[model samples]
Structure formats: C-alpha cells, structure tokens
Target: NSMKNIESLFDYSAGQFEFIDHLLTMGVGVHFAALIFFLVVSQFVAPKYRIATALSCIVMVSAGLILNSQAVMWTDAYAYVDGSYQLQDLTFSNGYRYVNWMATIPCLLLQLLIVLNLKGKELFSTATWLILAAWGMIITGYVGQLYEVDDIAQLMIWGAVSTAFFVVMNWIVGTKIFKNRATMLGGTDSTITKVFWLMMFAWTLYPIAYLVPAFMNNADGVVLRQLLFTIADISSKVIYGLMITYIAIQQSAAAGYVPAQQAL
Candidate 1:
C-alpha cells in the first residue's frame, strides 16, 4: 500500500524531471571515463605543456563545480511553487555568474597565445567568433535576469547566440583545427592522440544534441525550456570534464623546456 501510494504520487511524466535524471547519469559516466583517461595520459607528455594543462584543468573543474551548484539551486527554486520561501530562492546574481571569470580570463589569454603561435594568421577565426558570441549571450542574459523581466525574446536571443557559437566552435576545433594539427604533430602513435580524437567526438555531440532542438522549437514554449536546460547541462559538464582530463594527463607527462625550446 505504501509503495502503491508513493508510485501514484510520483510524477514520472514531468519531462524536465526525467531530463535531469538522464543528465545526472550521463554526467557521471562521462566524468568517470575522463578520470580514467587523465590518469593514463599523465604517465606519458613535456613539462611546459603539462603545467599549463594542469592549471587549465584546475580552473575548468572549479568553474564546472560552481556552475553545477548554481544550476541545482535554480532547479530547486523552479521545482517548488510556494511563494512563501521565494526570498530564499537562489536567484541568478552577478556574483554567482562571475565565478566563470576564473576560466574566462585564462581562456582569453590563451586565445591570444594561440593566435600568436599561428604567426599572426587567423588560425582560429571560428573560436574567436564563438568566444565573442558566448560573451554577448552571457552579458545579455544577465541583463535580462537582473531586470526581473520574463522577456522571452531576451532568453531566445541568448539561447540562439550561445547555441550557434558552440555548434560552430565544436565543428572548427574537432574537424579543421585538430585534424590538420594532429597530422603535423606526429604524435598519432601516442595514446594522447586517441584520447584527443575521442574527446573531440564526444564534445561534438554536444552541439548537435543541443542546438538542433533549440533551432526546431519556438522560443518560449515548454519544449524550448526543456531543451535549453538539457543541452546546457550536458554540454557544460561533458566538455569541461573531457577538457580537465586531457589537461591533467598532458601536464603529468610534460618536461621543462629551455629558452630555445621552440627552435629545437
């Protein structure tokens, strides 16, 4: 009787609830795989790249954890209907979002370094555009959220911009950039190479599984809301996990270089 009552009260038909469960499971699997890969790769790369990679991993993981916590708060707030504890609800605030600054600042600096390494040529135009789009979306979304307006247009715009940016960026990195560079680097024999390509494949699915739904759905409906949340959860967690794992492995293997390192 108790089991029957519990089953009757539980709402499995709620799409968002089911989606959250799916995301949690998928995230766990991806993180576990990444952890194993990182451990394996740490045994083999040069010290300079290794240090940078380690720093990147730390920054990414920290940011991911903070973001995940914030997301959980938002989910909890949305799940309840009692206006009594509304004040206690974790509303989106600048400080919470600013936790991303740790990762973004380093990323901006890295972007410049990557461009410089390309010898003054635009080696990553797609990445640059994507970064800009992401920044734009983030800023605009904050503005909308801060104003306490349920402006669907603002949400739609931000979603479109972010989704487009991620999709294009994934394509550029996974296909054009990595393929050409991997061919030239001559490290294809290493396990790192296989891990690199595997991560690329995994990250690419993020944009497809996410952006396609956003593009097909109208901006303000239940479908849009569910898809946006689902995509954001998957893309953010999976990509960051893979990235941190790769960085950790790379850092563990790298050796220190001298002044004329690049020349050699």
Candidate 2:
C-alpha cells in the first residue's frame, strides 16, 4: 500500500475546500494541455531529439493521470455536511503524486541526457546514477510525509535525509549534466542557461511543500501544500518539457534540418 496521512482532512470552510477543489481541477487541465502541446511539437525536432519530445509526452500523461486521481480523491474524501465540508469514510492523500513522480522525474532526467546527445557508456552510467538518486530523494520524502501526523521529529529527520539525496541529485545534474552544456548544439545560448535555472527553482519547491505539515498542519496548510505541489508540477514538468523541446529543435536547426530551421 501507499503511504498516506489522514491529517489532511479537516472541517474545512467552504472557501478553503473550494480553493482546493478548483486548484486540483486546474492541475488536470494544465497537465493535459502540455500533453497535446508536446505531442504536436514532437514532429518538428530531429529523429535523435524525438526521444526527448516523446519523454515529455510520457511525463505529461503521468502527471495528468495523477492530478486527475487526486481531484477525484478530493471529492470522495469529503462531503457537504451542515453547510461545510466534512471528512468521509474515504481518504485523500497526495501519495499518488509521489508515485507519479517516480515515473516523470526519471523521464525528465533522461530527456535532458537525450537532448544533450550523451552516448555510449557515459550515458548509461550517468543515467543509472541519476535514476538511483531520484528514487532515493523521492522515497525518503514519501517516508517523511508518512510521519506528518503523530511524529514531527520523524518528518523533519526523513525530510533532511530526502534533502540530502536532493543535494546529491542536484550535484549530479549540475556537474555531470550541465557541465557538458558547451558541447551541445546551441548549448551556450542564453535560453539553455535560463531553463537550467528555472528547473532548479521549480525542483526546490517540492521540499518546501513537503515540510508544510511540520509548520502549519491545518486545513489552510493542506490547501497551500496542494497548490505548491501543483505549481511545482506544472513548472517542472510542462514548462521544463517545453524548454527541453526547444533545445532539441534548436539542435535540429543547427544540423541544417530545413524544417527545424524554417520554424526557428
């Protein structure tokens, strides 16, 4: 079974519950919009870069499905009782978002490598490390989230452990991945640098959202946490995907692909 904490459920005011419901519903639309955008844009890139585009599609679909599930769970977890939202027998948990991250995060990492055209053993070797680091970071965060209700100490400790892994993950991304930027086609461009920084900013939001229960631990906290996660998801996955696709198309343009060149 997945890890879940029931601390999220509360006698939420109408405004609080409505904000969460609409936010989650909006998450669904955001992810699916990226899905179609990536699908259509994939054809414009070269064959080698198509994998990056394809991976973007995978990330969006995973995020879309998970957001949809979360929205469904939100309704089932509560019912209109006495003019306010009250907990039902069913539960709502953000655990599913972590599950989806297991898929999307690794794909995002691999897409970066693909767009860079990393080859042979170097590609495979770094991929193994990145994937392992990604799993470690996410799994530790999952464990930390489970302790949010009765054990704030465990939550902080596990979150620290998760942050340790995040540090390692970012090191690899910065040193191993971004270090090769000069070699990539149009790698030195300002856009590439912007996207890299954008990714960093987006990824940092996850840990901040994860620790919300430690401080707030209330209905307002829960709603804010969900909003943070949704914002991070859209920026990290969809916006990042679009930027990666742009890099791929830029590569295609550099290689004298007439279609890519004309579009650029």
Candidate 3:
C-alpha cells in the first residue's frame, strides 16, 4: 500500500549509524588484508594449485575496491540533524556488492574445482554451468532489488527467478562437484564438509538479507541487512578463501611437495 526505500524511511541514532560505518570500513580492511594473505601464502601450495590462490587474490582486490566505495557512499548519504543521523536527498544503494559478487562468485567456484583436481572436460563444463548459474542468480536478484522501494510485485517476481538459479548452483556444487571430495582427499572429508556447509550458510544469508526489507520495512531492517551482508562477505570471501588455501596446502603436502612439507 506504500513505498519503502533503504535510505529514506527512517532516522538513525548515533550508535546505529556509526555501527554501519564501522561495518563498511571493516569490510574494506578485511579484504585488503586478505589480498596480502593470499599473495604470500601462494608459495606454500604447489604450482598447479597456485591458481586457486590467484583467484582468491582477485576476489579480495575486487572486494576491497567495491567495499571502499560502499563506505564512501555510506558517509555521503547521511547528515547529522539535531540528535540523529538522517538520510539525505541523495540515495545510498549497496548495489555495488551485487556487482562485486557477480565478478567473484564464479571465481570462487572455479577455484574450488581447481583445488579439487577436477580435470579436463569435467572442469570446463562444470565451470561453465556454475558461472552461468551464478550470473543468472545475481543479475536476477539485482533486478528484483531495483523494486525494493516501489513495486513489491516486481521484487517478488524477480526474487523468485533469482532463487531458482540459486538452487541450481547449490545442486551443482552439493551433489555434482562435492560428492567425490572425500575420495579425492583419500577417505577424509570431515574438514571439507564443515567448510562446505559453512559456505552454504554464508551463501544463504544473502537472500535472507535481500528479503528483510520486505518484512521489516524500516531502519532496523536496513541495519540488519547490512549486518547480514558484512557477515556473509567475511564468511564467503575471506574465510572461504582461507579454507581453500588450506586445502591446497594439504594436497600439496600429501603429494610430497617440498615447500608444502616444510611449511606444514
């Protein structure tokens, strides 16, 4: 019956506004730190698996740049009015994150397959399918997000379309790619399983954050959405990259690689 938008619907207390600023800065700082981490740790993995680290560096760099932009937008979008921070005439949209995800998600999947040693035709085809599905999911969600302030009906329609592609990605990764991971790791899948589910948990948060505005439709929802995004970024990009590098190092050690052995 009414229109609701991210920045315009409510005024925030000093604490709430500062918390959002803190989260945005933390996002930038974390990704920049990860850039250095992946760069240095690539030496601990075998040459064959070094590309996975390279992909991680890509993710970190892109995240760092986009997150910095988001932080800048956050500072610019608010003005101190009386006792509270209020939204200005300018809009602050977190749409940059979806663009960042569009760039990084396929790389994340490809790096997983690379570390898993899925080779030749299977790797190529799986990568193609995963990339296609990821792009579809993110793009559709972005389309839906455009309507968050105005037309709830269009948002619902595109959100459902986006969700279908999300299911496709999970099916591909869960059933198709990951089923043989234990065998690849020589009968030990415990650690990989934990990280896999962690990835799923982090990935699932995005949609929940996406839908939060529809339910709460207020300042609390806006803050909650940013919180979810921050957590998901840390989990999916930073920790997930660390886990992938750890697996690469382990695989290298198992294969009797000298550098990996000494590092371990």
Q: Which candidate leads in TM-score?
A: 2
lDDT of 1 by residue, 1-264 (tens): 111111112223345444544554454455445445544443343443343334444444554555565446435544423422222333423234334643453453242223122332454554465466555545544443332233445545665665565455445444544444443222322443454465455444433433332344321232343344445434444454444434333323232323223323
Least accurate stretch of 10 residues (summed lDDT) in model 1?
A: 1-10
What is residue 206's positional error in candidate 1, in angstroms?
7.8
Best by lDDT: 3
lDDT ranking, high to low: 3, 2, 1
Cα lDDT tens digits, model 2, 149-182, are 8688998999889888888988887776557777
The RMSD of every model to the true structure, in order and in angstroms, is 9.8, 1.7, 2.4
Give the clashing residue pairs of candidate 2, or none.
Answer: none
Model 1 TM-score (2 dp)? 0.45
- lDDT by residue (1-264, candidate 3, tens digit) is 112356566889998899988998999999999899999989988887889999999999999898888788778888999999987756467677889999999889988888778889999999999999999999999888878888888888999999999998888888754676765452225566766798889999999998986898878888899899999999999999998888888888887788988998
Comparing 2 and 3 on lDDT, the stronger one? 3
Model 1 segments more than 4 A misplaced = 1-40, 71-133, 141-149, 157-183, 187-264
User: Clash number for model 2?
Assistant: 0
